[PDB]
Amino acid sequence: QKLVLYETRARYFLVGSNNAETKYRVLKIDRTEPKDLVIIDDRHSGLFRAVSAFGVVGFVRFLEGYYIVLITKRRKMADIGGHAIYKVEDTNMIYIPNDSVRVTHPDEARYLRIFQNVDLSSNFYFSYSYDLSHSLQYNLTVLRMGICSEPYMKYVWNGELLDIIKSTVHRDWLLYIIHGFCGQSKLLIYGRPVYVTLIARRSSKFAGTRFLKRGANCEGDVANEVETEQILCDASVMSFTAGSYSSYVQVRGSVPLYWSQDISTMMPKPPITLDQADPFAHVAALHFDQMFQRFGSPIIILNLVKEREKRKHERILSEELVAAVTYLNQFLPPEHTIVYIPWDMAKYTKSKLCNVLDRLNVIAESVVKKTGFFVNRPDSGGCVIPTGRLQTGILRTNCVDCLDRTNTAQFMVGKCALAYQLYSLGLIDKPNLQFDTDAVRLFEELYEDHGDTLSLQYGGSQ
Template identity: 45%
Template sequence: MKQQFLGRLSAPPSTEFFDSNSNKVDRLVLNKFTLYETKTNYYVVGSNQSDNRFRILKIDRTTPTELNVIEDDVIYSKIEIMDTLSYLEEGNKTSGGLNKVLSAYGIVGFIKFTDGYYISLITKRSAVALIGGHYIYHIDETTLRPIGQRTKPEKNSDEYKYINIFNNVDLTKNFYFSYTYDITHTLQHNMTRPPNRRNFSYNEMFVWNSYLLENGFRSLKNNSDWILPIIHGFVDQSKISIFGRNIVVTLIARRSRYFAGARFLKRGVNDQGYVANDVETEQIVSEMSTTSFHRSGLHDNPYYTSYVQHRGSIPLFWSQDVNLAPKPPIEINFRDPFFAAAALHFDNMFKRYGAPIIVLNLIKTKEKNPREGILGDEFAETMDYLSQFLPDKCLKYIAWDMSKARKGDDDVVDLMEGFAEEYLADTGFFHSGPEAWINKRRMYLRQNGIVRTNCIDCLDRTNAAQLIIGKCALGHQLYALGIIDKPWVPVDSDVVNMLTDMYHDHGDTIALQYGGSNLVNTIDSYRKINQWTSHSRDLIENLRRYYNNAFADAEKQDAINLFLGNFVPEKGKINLWDLPNDYYLHNEDPRYKRQRRSYIHWWTKDVLQVKDDQQLDVSRYQLVPRLARQFDDETDPYSGYWIEYYRPRLFTSFEKLFASNMNSTTKYIPAT
């Protein structure tokens, strides 16, 4: 599209959010999209929440095998966009005119199989959470449309097969996005980073549509207004009143897109240090007396807390054969005396979370026929080797046979709570401002370090342990907010029942994504209640899990590899379904191995800093001057996104205003 008919910048620069260092407009938040087509082009018109400013994306349709996407930098007013569309209608009248195709809520990205490119669009969404005035949405429906002229591929063609494989990644199941909140990062990161776009970047580890977006926009780092990152995992939000104060608990699980896949086809670690079933779980507890992140300054609302945990497969080269045996044997495929892949994994974790990394290994230690113990011994040797070169207390390894404790007389929950209190003392948690004055504790709290929990599958035992750790964190979070008078909540309280329900849903969702069934063992199994119900659930879920692993995982793995860009189809070359396995898709070509890192100084020194040695960054608590604006703007870091939440010029019902259907705790109250 040529500049002469694209008009001018509709709003004076003073009304935009500027990056003071570069003197450029920050961004326009686009959350409504309309797709138009002519014979030669697609035009995507994106608008802000108020429908008063617009941008245009042009996609060339004349060469569908080559993707040509042009972002127009001009921002249009309502009148200007109507004039531009009229101009396009008139200019294409002889070839069929300008036709509206559909309305959408976001661009998932672009994908090419063997013939030409397709565009994937979000056509339905639902709000599932509200954090600081920012909506988080679940994808309810998508559509895949060819860029070129619509022609139905032949039924037995490679193109047809690839489309079916691609559609096996169901984007309507546990994929989430937000227009104004960076859900790829933790709350601590979002509330402490410097407030301009030059310091903004998505965590690409959790952007599942990264490959699809980069096909059209080259890089996620260019901060295009059209880029909408999508995470895969779990989001839930619940509300409860404690002593008359409204508390909202939000649980966000982010699945890594690196080395992702189905249970038996993705075990252990690859040679780049990425592990299977890598999930970051964040527990946000906030008091809703003030919804916004801001009070008197930028991000200074003291009523937000968060605690982050991690789960991931044991970082060794190991596997299990896919078969119908209840417990397939475990094999260690390769033994590295210097544990280079595990070193890469923990170095990456130091970069992500700081120190200490507390590794909680819950696999069995004593078995009649050694199975899990084979991995346990090798993992212990790995941790001994890696930790000997580190400063003290940076990498802690705890091996605890949770299954044995469950079968014995020990109270698993009480023991785990004792461990959790130690872990919380080591890592801390995030609090956005000073604690309530009645606590007389620290002024500002940051989480530095993380608890990394694993069992064999990182599903059942791991989820139970994470729930207990989350329960202990909840007590400290409520205490920091001044809600309770000591940092502890009883097991059989309403708020813990609510949290338990959320973690069960969280565990079931991750188990379905990785293992093909719900959790086999829940926290009730470890509390030794409802044993008959638990036993019947164990049997059913085990059968479902092994059936899915044997018959459905291969198709799921192919779809994930295609969606994430691990395999790129090329006409006339090897097909995805002809590969004996996908090993080479996730590991480096041995002919082009990167230079080996030091076997002794295996970590990145700059990021390895124990919490007690860190200096408090007080710069973020200083007031940031606000620029004069003629009207509220979604890019205003103080109040702009309220246009999405509060619509002053639009009739809004209470049902719409209360952003999500939060879980109710009334089910825990006995009927009278």
């Protein structure tokens, strides 16, 4: 919940705005020789201005001093099933010293500058009631509605900032913001009021002795990964109006190839050493094991070829991925578990390109189902009475392919799924939802915005 703070010579004191129960904890960062974090009884300072803030994101020790990172204000970007999603508007980095010049030297100052740049450049989101770090399907599994213990570590942006507080264990204080995009739009289809939402969360990269953005580490973590989730809330017209909520998730990320890569583009073209040893097989396997755990029932991997090869435009990473996937030939319950599809999606972009997308779906369809999405029925009050279905599988695209193309693939796939979700509620008969012009426009705009927001990673290619 919201927090309130008092600052004095002693340092900073934080407490929940609303104190439920007799014993409420106070967090104190101390000015003293230690700029330690402490847990205190409710001896909050009596005199001083009380400042209200949306959340205490955490603390960081830059060189000698420790700073508190705070999200002062937020705006409500979305509301689903009673949960409110907020974006952090204004933030602050606060230090105990009150103009400690001596403490500050250029090394520490530089660090703060770096952090400021990141806080400014990024867009963080959180919900007090709902865990944004996890997909709706994952949250369903967790169950007890919270809390920070349950969040998905890959996505918990302020995991590191939280370290001191996690040690102590004052749950109210720990709130896990997200980087990409979140928006909802109200629409009407067949006289049924509807809320459509789209959220993209981008991954914050990861633990390990050494690093590299592209590829997977020994542990099986890729570092560049995003989840895109389409959510819908509608009321069944027929019968007592029951509210249904749906979620459909997709993933995009770096090709799970061991990070060791010869980036000597300058020199002659590199061949990638998949594994005289076996890191490529090992890393990929470990990555896939994680993916199957989270997403479950198969991960269908879509790789977009886009190569004539007359020029013989062959990519080392491209071939590597397929060979590795084939080599693993995942098996365990019936079905491989991971399916691989190379797919040619070429121009003309507004015509032939879309047609191919549908073709891609068909091929996937041999393997995947439109029905596979999360669905639940809440009561008035927004609690969940039933769980109609859970999403077993996920379609994973590649970060390397054009964001333009991938976004298109994701958008189209979501439309195919949406139709079934509308069917389920009985909002639409067997026919196509797309016919509704206003609705499609809303839908298109939502996705277009998403692509714009997400394209934030880099600007360019050759």
